[PDB]
Amino acid sequence: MSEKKRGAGTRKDEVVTREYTINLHKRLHGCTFKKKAPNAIKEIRKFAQKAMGTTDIRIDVKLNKAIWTNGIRSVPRRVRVRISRKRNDEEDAKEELYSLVTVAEIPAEGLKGLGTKVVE
Amino acid sequence: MPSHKTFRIKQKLAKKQRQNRPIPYWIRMRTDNTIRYNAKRRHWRRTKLGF
Amino acid sequence: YNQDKMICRKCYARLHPRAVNCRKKKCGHSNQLRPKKKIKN
Amino acid sequence: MVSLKLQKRLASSVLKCGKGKVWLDPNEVNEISMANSRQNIRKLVKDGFIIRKPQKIHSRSRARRAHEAKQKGRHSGYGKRRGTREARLPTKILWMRRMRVLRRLLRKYREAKKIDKHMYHDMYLK
RNA sequence: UUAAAUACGCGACGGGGAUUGUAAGUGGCAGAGUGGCCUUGCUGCCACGAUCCACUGAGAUCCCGCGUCGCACGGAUUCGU
RNA sequence: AUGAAUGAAUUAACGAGAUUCCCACUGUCCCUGUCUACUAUCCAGCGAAACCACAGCCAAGGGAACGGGCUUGGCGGAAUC
RNA sequence: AACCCGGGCGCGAGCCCGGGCGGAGCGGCCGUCGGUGCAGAUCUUGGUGGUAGUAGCAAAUAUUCAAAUGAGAACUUUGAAGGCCGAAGAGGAGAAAGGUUCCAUGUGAACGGCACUUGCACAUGGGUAAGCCGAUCCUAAGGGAAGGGGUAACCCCG
RNA sequence: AGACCGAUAGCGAACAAGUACCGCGAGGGAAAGAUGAAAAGGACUUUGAAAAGAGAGUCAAAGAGUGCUUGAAAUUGCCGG
């Protein structure tokens, strides 16, 4: 999923990731109070597709668990998601995130640091 | 219990069951004449057993 | 016969009037039998 | 295809347990498929790829502490206290205790010797 | 009916009101009761603290915004005298 | 045009039996609103019947006296949801 | 011959030809036979259009994310997450009834009111083992076998 | 044997016919024929989700290609006026 440059311009790429917050509320409140939880999962599967610019999206089981944990009638307001993004194929991989409580800022930085660490 | 037992209905039911098999690939071939759709061949869901 | 069979409350497994106990799997003198109440509607 | 439906019947009837407790690994899928026989299933159960899941838990714990929460009174103001009036204990259930005790006391009292045969009849009648 | 690298454009942050109303953690004791301990004695302690106060006009925000990050460089289809 | 075992009268208890009144309450009502759910709608797939001599505008009139159509008047851009 | 298309005659019922198709039977005159002519009968049977790509596939809110396998995956199968069933709106054992529907392997024209790799669809193989379970033996409303007698007799009481 | 019928006719039944099927039962009860002179009954090759399709082969003829003589009507598509 294109963090595709290629070529450009900065950004020497194929995969990297970004952390994005998916707001469940707007479409979620459109689903039923009992039937809410499946809607969220779809919401996530549509937003990443939009943001990422790719049709092919993978959502991690972790994400499934997160939405479902409260149950069917309760879904979290939002969920931070780590969405990684590589290939000519241009496919999306997503999973859950972490946060004390805070901000949107430079999530790209942590990822860049991870890839740099992997190594020898 | 048995599973209604008597040999005398029980065998004849088993005979009709052996009798309800496909025609044997061969009798289509030597053959005289027919779209050989056998036909007295009976089914667990539909129509109903007789004696 | 008026005794019918005894059916186990745990396993739910049917084992005689002469057998003392159930044994379907290790039920094994669990003694947790009740007879067939001997015929309804 | 892989049809795992038959190992699920077999798996259940050798862990002597349900089909939603019996679990089969997603690495071993071909080897599981290859088992066609219980003696093969038994081997995969022995070698621990097929396994009987534990599966949430109880609630004895709230309830036994609920019994310690009766031990020890509580909730015997009028409101929380309720099935119907007698049904809870018909008082014939307290009589079944009282009537056996009052006659057990009267038998102990004679055999220690405290009362006469005349007094014993009257009180037993009393 | 809208906007589009000829743009305060979108998402994510949060600042505003106008939204609802006292958090999680933390302490005290009006107040339950009960037990043991420390000490010459006096005296106090610990324990399991039912309920309350205290640190708090806290958390959440179908509405509204300026400071960062990410994406916004695009093309299908059509034909009229 | 009541009337005594074609039973008369009378009457406690009982009753998904018939009629009436009161309090309680309430959206039945003043008088309607918002909201949920499943439908609806749109998409992929599956896929029917009833019915069908008949082309299928209105106002009048006429006619076996209750016309989608004759007669005179008047109107109509089709097709489609 | 039949059929389709047209050309000619006859008011006309109907006659005739030309072209194509078809690929074996077909007429005319006279004299006779007669299952001898339809638009219709809420006519019969068969086929077929519009109705229509329309109604139904809607109330237990039930799946979702990864993955297997596969020419093909919303519905086959694994895991996780999430629910639902509770005297059984979906647990266990059985009577009747069914009648092989069971197991396995291989398929996929039809079914499943959709997909299907699946199946209780199709095909081929395979499975049910009793001295101690049940049948079996007994006897209960009664089915009665057995005089005599009505009744031709069927048949019926005893 | 025939001024009989000739596959909606003649028997209900030209064939797998009192079959398939219906009814608890007594009883009820269909639809169902035709490649070609000869199987010569569609090799070999390309393709494809499957069937099938393309190309070619046999024959006087494949719109003779398997419920395969002829092939109306009612109807559908495409197309021409």
Burial A93-112, CB ≥16 within 10 A → b, else e = bbbbbeeeeeeeeebeeebe
Experimental method: cryo-EM
Which residue's CA is nearest to the C1' of nucleotide G97? B4
Q: Where are the alpha helices (DSSP H) in D1-126?
A: 5-15, 29-34, 38-46, 61-68, 93-111, 117-125
Q: Are the beta carbons of C36 and C5 closer than 8 angstroms?
A: yes
Resolution (angstroms) equals: 34.0
CA D51 / C1′ E19 distance in Å: 53
Helices and strands per DSSP (H, E), number in chain B: 1, 0
Nucleotide nearest the Cα atom of A30 (by C1'): E62
Strand H: list positions under 7 Å from protein Cβ. Answer: 15-16, 19-23, 25, 67
Which value, to the nearest 10 degrees, does the dihedral of the CA atoms of residues A28, A29, A33, A35 take?
-30
Q: Distance of CA A2 to CAs A22, A44, A47, A117, Å?
A: 19, 18, 15, 22
CA D63 / C1′ E32 distance in Å: 24
Residue D35 makes CB contacts below 8 A (sequence gap 6+) with D7, D10, D41, D43, D44
Rounded Cα distance between C10 and C27, Å, is 8
- Look-up of token digits 């009037």: C17
Nucleotide nearest the Cα atom of A29 (by C1'): E62
User: What are the strands of the beta sheet with A78-86, ordered from one edge?
Assistant: A17-23, A78-86, A91-96, A57-59
Nearest to A18 by CA among A43, A50, A51: A51
Residue A80 identity? R
The answer to whether the beta carbon of residue A62 comes closer than 7 angstroms to any atom of strand F is no
